């Protein structure tokens, strides 16, 4: 009953914006004080690599450690479905623990973005809800952020992706704004980032004409 | 072996005729010592009555043991707790679980129907979307329909924790462009405790 491992994927945004640096994180948790030394072994499709950086083991409140190891991945290796395996070895482990991740398999699909105004009757309130509908995308990794006149926005939340009946995903993002900003004529934008999109990005604007 | 205690369907705990129930499950239980035990207590106090289907053979050298207990509406709605004690072999201290309705001043959902965006009208199928916001707790049921009969091709997102402390979600119905252009009405029906008579409805349709 040694430590257990977890292998997390890169943030969707860091993989669609070529100028950033996506990376997989291999987290070993439940490491005892008796044997705090854990060894990481990375692989990219079986081909072991050595460019991983291990952060110094952090002390936990439940008398154990949490060790982290990260692997930068190439914009193109991840989006081409390369598989990343993290091998973990520590004395309190009969046999090393292997874990694997990689983009979901299955043909990608370009989502459509729709912006939808507030219902006329929400206009009796002080804040209105602008809606952005992203449908028909695959795989499910996606990023969504609202924006106006340059600066981003604060009051907006985005539903998790949802598996549609045709096999693709859809999600809605909700931007809340002071009713007045809306009635004036400001132009808000829905920015979406998905591999399938062109240049992995697209934007749809909504406003009161 | 791990335990999984599940709560009743929102729809079930809101319609009296229907019968809500809490489900207890046991994942990863080998063929060796499958035989289990189930103890159900309500806020300490107990009662003996919890049907228990057999160990449905599984696709990973294990089984899926499920234990269901029928509960009383207002008891669930009135934050009652429920305990399930699973007694096994590879379990020295047979894992237990407790669950109850969410705490906090209930809040009434506001329902908003949104028409398809005009450019989606070039596809041969459109999206009718239903925004359900400002509700608490998150237990809720939403379904679409037209002409008495219920629609089928629709999807509802999970409740989302908003910024002000309430939840919201969206429900997307897909209808053939022709049915929409023709002017047929569609309805979003929401069931939730904080709603008068636990139910409200909002119709949507191309105004002629």
């Amino acid at each position: 009953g040694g430590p257990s491992v977890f292998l997390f994927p890169p943030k969707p945004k860091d993989t669609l914006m070529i100028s950033r640096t996506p990376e997989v994180t291999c987290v070993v948790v439940d490491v005892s004080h008796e044997e705090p030394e854990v060894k990481f072994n990375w692989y990219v499709d079986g081909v072991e690599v050595h460019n991983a950086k291990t952060k110094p083991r952090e002390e936990q409140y439940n008398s154990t450690y949490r060790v982290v190891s990260v692997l930068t991945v190439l914009h193109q290796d991840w989006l081409n479905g390369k598989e990343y395996k993290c091998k973990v070895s520590n004395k309190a482990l009969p046999a090393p623990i292997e874990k694997t991740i990689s983009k979901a398999k299955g043909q990608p699909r370009e989502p459509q973005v729709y912006t939808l105004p507030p219902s006329r009757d929400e206009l009796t309130k002080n804040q209105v809800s602008l809606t952005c509908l992203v449908k028909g995308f695959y795989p499910s990794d996606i990023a969504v952020e609202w924006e106006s006149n340059g600066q981003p926005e604060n009051n907006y939340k985005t539903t998790p992706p949802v598996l549609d009946s045709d096999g693709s995903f859809f999600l809605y993002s909700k931007l809340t704004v002071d009713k007045s900003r809306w009635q004036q004529g400001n132009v808000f934008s829905c920015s979406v980032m998905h591999e399938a999109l062109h240049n992995h990005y697209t934007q749809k604007s909504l406003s009161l004409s | 072996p791990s335990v999984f205690l599940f709560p009743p369907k929102p729809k079930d705990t809101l319609m009296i005729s229907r019968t809500p129930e809490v489900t207890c499950v046991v994942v990863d239980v080998s063929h060796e010592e499958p035989e289990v035990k189930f103890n159900w207590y309500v806020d300490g106090v107990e009662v003996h009555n919890a049907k228990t289907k057999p160990r449905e053979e599984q696709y990973n050298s294990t089984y899926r043991v499920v234990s269901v207990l029928t509960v009383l509406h207002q008891d669930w709605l009135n934050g009652k707790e429920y305990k399930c004690k699973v007694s096994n072999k590879a379990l020295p201290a047979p894992i237990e679980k407790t669950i109850s309705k969410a705490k906090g001043q209930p809040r009434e959902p506001q329902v908003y129907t949104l028409p398809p965006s005009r450019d989606e009208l070039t596809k041969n199928q459109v999206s009718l979307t239903c925004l359900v916001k400002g509700f608490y707790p998150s237990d809720i049921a939403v379904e679409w329909e037209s002409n008495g009969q219920p629609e089928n091709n629709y999807k509802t997102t999970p409740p989302v924790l908003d910024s002000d402390g309430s939840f919201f979600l969206y429900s997307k119905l897909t209808v053939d462009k022709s049915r929409w252009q023709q002017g047929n009405v569609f309805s979003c029906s929401v069931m939730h405790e904080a709603l008068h008579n636990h139910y409200t409805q909002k119709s949507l349709s191309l105004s002629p």
């Epitope: 132009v187 697209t202 749809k204 604007s205 909504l206 | 005009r118 450019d119 009208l121 070039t122 462009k177």
Partner: antibody
Framework: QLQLQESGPGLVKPSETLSLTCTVS??????????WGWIRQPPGKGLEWIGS???????YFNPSLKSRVTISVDTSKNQFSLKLSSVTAADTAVYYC???????????????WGQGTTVTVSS | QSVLTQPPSASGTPGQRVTISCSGS????????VYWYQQLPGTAPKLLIY???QRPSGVPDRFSGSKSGTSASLAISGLRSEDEADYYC???????????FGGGTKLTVLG
Amino acid sequence: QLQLQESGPGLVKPSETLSLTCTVSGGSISRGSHYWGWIRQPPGKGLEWIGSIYYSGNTYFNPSLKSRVTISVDTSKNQFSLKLSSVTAADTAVYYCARLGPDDYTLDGMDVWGQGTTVTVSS
Amino acid sequence: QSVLTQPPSASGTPGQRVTISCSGSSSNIGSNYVYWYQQLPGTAPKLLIYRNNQRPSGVPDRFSGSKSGTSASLAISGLRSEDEADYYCATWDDSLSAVIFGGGTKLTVLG
């Protein structure tokens, strides 16, 4: 208020590729509430839709001739453009650039049209 | 099934009232909004009616649009001379997935 002005070589020799541009004034394509497109009309016959484009890039073409058309926008200069390749005698007409229908995201009507521009495929 | 057909020509007489039809299909004029543009000799077409029968502010009440079945029609009342031009109907055609226009209708106020 809002206006669209076509710009382009009044002439194009066979097999070549036509190239026009549309400038908008009193309205910023960047607002993102409307689509913009091109419509041509051979002197004799009637009107024909070619394509529409959204400020973000996404464009819609006419199946009759998409394989040989190219549309693009430049937010900076606030204008969109057209490119018709392998021009023959058919592709000879007046090229208008209009904004799509009065309603936001309209994709089937043009409420505001450009002055017009002739394009003869001479030799 | 894939193209609107209007009368090649019309013509009337001042003060009168005329109608121009646009015979279409279900894949188009029968499932989408119809548009009507006016084109006075050597000019960029002018939007006359949108969404079957809406008149964009700046268009005479005499101009009206309507649809029914797989057809639509424009109707001019109180005809004048400044009305003899060419008129066209247009809608989206889900079969071709593109905008489409009719052939056009002449119409010349006789006088």
